[PDB]
Amino acid sequence: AERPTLPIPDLLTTDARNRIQLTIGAGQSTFGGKTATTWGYNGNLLGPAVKLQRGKAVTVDIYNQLTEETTLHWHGLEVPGEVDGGPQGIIPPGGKRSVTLNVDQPAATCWFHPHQHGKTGRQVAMGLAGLVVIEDDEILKLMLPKQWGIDDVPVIVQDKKFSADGQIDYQLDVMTAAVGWFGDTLLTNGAIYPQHAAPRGWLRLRLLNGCNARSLNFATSDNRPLYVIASDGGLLPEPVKVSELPVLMGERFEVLVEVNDNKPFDLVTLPVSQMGMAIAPFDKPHPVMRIQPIAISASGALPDTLSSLPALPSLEGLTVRKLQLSMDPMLDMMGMQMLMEKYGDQAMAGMDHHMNHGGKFDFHHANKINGQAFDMNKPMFAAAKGQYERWVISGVGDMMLHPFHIHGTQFRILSENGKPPAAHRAGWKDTVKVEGNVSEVLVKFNHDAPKEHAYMAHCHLLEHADTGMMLGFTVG
């Protein structure tokens, strides 16, 4: 059998009333010939790409046709807390919520997904994620590849595992609370190892790591380079040529790759040094999708310059906030034990050389920031509006991977886990690596968030956030 074609999310724009309609619902999908109940936006699985324009307002009508509560968060969008869709943004089952997004940030690929309190991992694992394509005047002048689904394609990469009956096998338990939910099956826009037919010249890939817990590292099967043009929050100042591209959970990068006649190649993910993530088939390079060259010329350019990246300011005088991430030692030890018992030494490949005691020892609140498991009723602090702050985020005390994400902003990384950031990570980011060390970011919030609709800051290893590694904060 031939490989399925890469599914392409519909690129959705507003109607005459200026509205975009999103319906959240359950249906069936097929994986390896076996049906599974899945959830999607405007469909059975995953979701559309919502197209937004800087300086224009759109209204999104969100219909929850699930039988449980959910929320819809716009990861990477700089919007007020009231429309941010964090855990306080509840949409009742069978209900509708509408939000107006006043887009005011540069062109970027953002995304959206649920933020249901303590259930975000499950709801994403079930299928809910969509994309946001923000454009502005600046990006269109660059004449990058721009034909959606032809030479400009989104690539949402996710793992799942399935039970013998074919259903998605999700659990939030002591093991996954420590190391995350991960699986053995890799999906690319929902499909297993699809092919994408691309014209000769430049191919633009908008890469999203949509895994709950698995970090990825993209490369090509024949070692042709990737030219990074954009990060979470938009364009880099100029392209950055890489041979491999690590992507943390929830991160986006846009890359250009050359397509030449008669030479198909795969986009692959390389084994990572993260606990549990190098179990077969992920102990070796793993194909993500096959690029099939078409002998028709592609019109897109890779310009020498993309955008202007403003200078980092002086750091003296700016508020410094400490965010200490932590995991309960016993539940970290127990989750790791369970992982080692199940998979053996392979669960640490590539790394460096039973009774009820009550609610105090519950793994559901074992993960914390500044000694507190997330309390939705108590924002931990009030950040300044329109002022640069230096946020210092520490994972000293455990060796788990914490891609730390801050709502309401695109920031600049000053130190990523104890080193200056790589060039392609030095632009606009909404995620920073924290793993047994300390990161520092320079952040500014341009919009208000009240106690009732607070911004979140949390680990994007979703099972950590669901078991307490999140805080709320207000702005204004």
User: Which residue numbers belong to the known binding site for Cu cation?
Assistant: 73, 75, 113, 115, 402, 405, 407, 458-460, 464
Our finding on whether 206 is near ligand [O-] (CB under 6 A) is no
| Residue 39 contacts residue 123 (beta carbons within 8 Å) | yes
| Choice between 412 and 460, CB closer to ligand [O-] | 460
Span 391-450, contacts to ligand [O-] by CB under 6 A: 405
Residue 129 or 144 having the CB closest to Cu ion: 129
Whole-number Å distance between alpha carbons of 235 and 255:
10
Could you say which of ligand [O-], Cu ion, none residue 402 binds, taking C-beta under 5 to 8 angstroms by partner kind? Cu ion
**What's the min distance (Å) between Cβ of 461 and ligand [O-]?**
11
- Nearest approach in angstroms of CB 296 to Cu ion is 36
Nearer to ligand [O-], 153 or 323 (CB): 323
Q: State in angstroms the smallest separation of the CB of 405 from ligand [O-].
A: 5
Closer to ligand [O-] by CB, 349 or 406: give it: 406
Q: How far is the CB of 185 from ligand [O-] (least distance, A)?
A: 23
Show contacts with Cu ion in window 71-90 (CB under 5 A): 75
- Residues 212-271 interacting with Cu ion (rule: CB under 5 A): 250
Give Cβ neighbours of residue 355 (< 8 Å, ≥ 6 apart): none
State yes or no: residue 471 binds Cu ion (CB under 5 A). no
Encoded one letter per residue, x for contact with Cu ion by CB under 5 A and - for no contact, window 398-437 reads: ----x----x------------------------------
* CB closer to ligand [O-] out of 115 and 196: 115
Residue among 73, 204, 425, 444 that touches ligand [O-] (CB under 6 A): 73
With CB under 5 to 8 Å by kind, the binding choice for 289 among ligand [O-], Cu ion, none is none
The entry of ligand [O-], Cu ion, none near residue 464 (CB within 5 to 8 angstroms by kind) is: Cu ion
Shortest Cβ 399–Cu ion spacing (Å): 11
CA distance 49 to 208: 12
C-alpha span between 253 and 207 (Å, rounded): 5
Name the binder of 433 from Cu ion, ligand [O-], none, CB < 5-8 A by kind: none
Q: Is 75 in the site for ligand [O-] (CB under 6 A)?
A: yes
* Residue that is written with structure tokens 């807390």 in the block: 81
Cβ neighbours of residue 144 under 8 Å, at least 6 residues apart? 152, 202, 204, 229, 256, 300, 301, 302, 303
Per CB under 5 A, 461 contacts Cu ion: yes
Residue nearer to ligand [O-] on the CB measure, 31 or 455 = 455
Min separation Cβ 92 and ligand [O-], Å? 21
Residue 277: which residues within 8 A CB-CB, separation 6 or more? 182, 214, 215, 271
**Which residues in this chain contact Cu ion in the complex, by CB under 5 A?**
75, 250, 402, 407, 456, 459, 461, 464
Chain residues binding ligand [O-] by CB under 6 A are 73, 75, 115, 405, 460
